[PDB]
């Protein structure tokens, strides 16, 4: 996150970090004790990923961290990186052993399709992660967060030579300076509704980070909630 602020401990208790061949390479969100939602571009069937919940500062021990192995990776069935790296940029991770929920390790709420979209249209969400704090810069040690406004679709289309699909949304600032960045992928874009946070997006992609006239692009979660609910059901 470029131009954000340090989170407080427990401020984003749904946030997880993914470690793999590279540490802290991507983020995620807790769906429930057994399941994480992240970005498909972060993952792939059989490469060794560990999830850490309850994390704050990625180099120190807070004694709130919960480390789990991933037993199954479920990229969305429409995701196909050979055709488009960021369309349908969403995947599910099944943990081997459940998380123990507490004030530092709490799921994000996920509404139905209609309400997810209603929430997204409130137009202000929070993004968070341990990604780069400048384009091509250093990553964060302490979890960073940023409030980002929703950007009008037509405005977003006009800003780029790339294609923004209907299962994507744009958020950020016209003047630059504040954005999600490399290493934040997979983490949550959440909307707070009367004090309860709901997942509205997945951090996905962008052209550089925080540049004037460019926006962050996010997976539109409302398009995937039925699939999330069906794959992640515990009962």
């Amino acid at each position: 996150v470029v131009g954000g602020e340090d989170a407080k401990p427990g401020q984003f208790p749904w946030q997880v970090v993914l470690n793999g061949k590279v540490d802290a390479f991507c983020g995620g969100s807790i769906v429930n004790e057994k399941w994480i939602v992240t970005a498909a571009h972060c993952v792939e069937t059989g490469v060794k990923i560990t999830v850490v919940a309850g994390e704050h500062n990625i180099e120190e021990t807070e004694h709130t961290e919960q480390k789990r192995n991933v037993i199954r990776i479920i990229p969305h069935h429409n995701y196909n990186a050979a055709i488009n790296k960021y369309n349908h940029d969403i995947a599910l991770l099944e943990l081997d052993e459940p998380l123990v929920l507490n004030s530092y390790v709490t799921p994000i709420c996920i509404a139905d399709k209609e309400y997810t979209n209603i929430f997204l249209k409130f137009g202000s969400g929070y993004v968070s992660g341990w990604g780069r704090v400048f384009h091509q810069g250093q990553s964060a040690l302490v979890l960073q967060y940023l409030r980002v406004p929703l950007v009008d679709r037509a405005t977003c289309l006009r800003s780029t030579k790339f294609t923004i699909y209907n299962n994507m949304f744009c958020a950020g600032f016209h003047e630059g300076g504040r954005d999600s960045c490399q290493g934040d992928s997979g983490g949550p874009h959440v909307t707070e509704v009367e004090g309860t946070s709901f997942l509205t997006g997945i951090i996905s992609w962008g052209e550089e980070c925080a540049m004037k006239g460019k926006y962050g692009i996010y997976t539109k979660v409302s398009r995937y909630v039925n699939w999330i609910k069906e794959k992640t059901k515990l009962t």
Binding site: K8, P9, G10, Q11, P13, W14, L101, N102, S103, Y104, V105, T106, P107, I108, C109, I110, A111, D112, Y115, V190, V193, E194, G195, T196, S197, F198
Partner: protein, 62 residues
Amino acid sequence: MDVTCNIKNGRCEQFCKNSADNKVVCSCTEGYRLAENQKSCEPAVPFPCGRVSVSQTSKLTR
């Protein structure tokens, strides 16, 4: 009387579904239950989703 999901979400804090005679039924996501007022949502489990349970209390001085 005049209450509807099309206007102010039926006064429901979370979710609204229209009921007979221009009444609504409010509801909540998993881990919450409807409060006494049949509008608001309150936790029904110890660590319900989407809730920040650690105090954010902080302050900026000079």
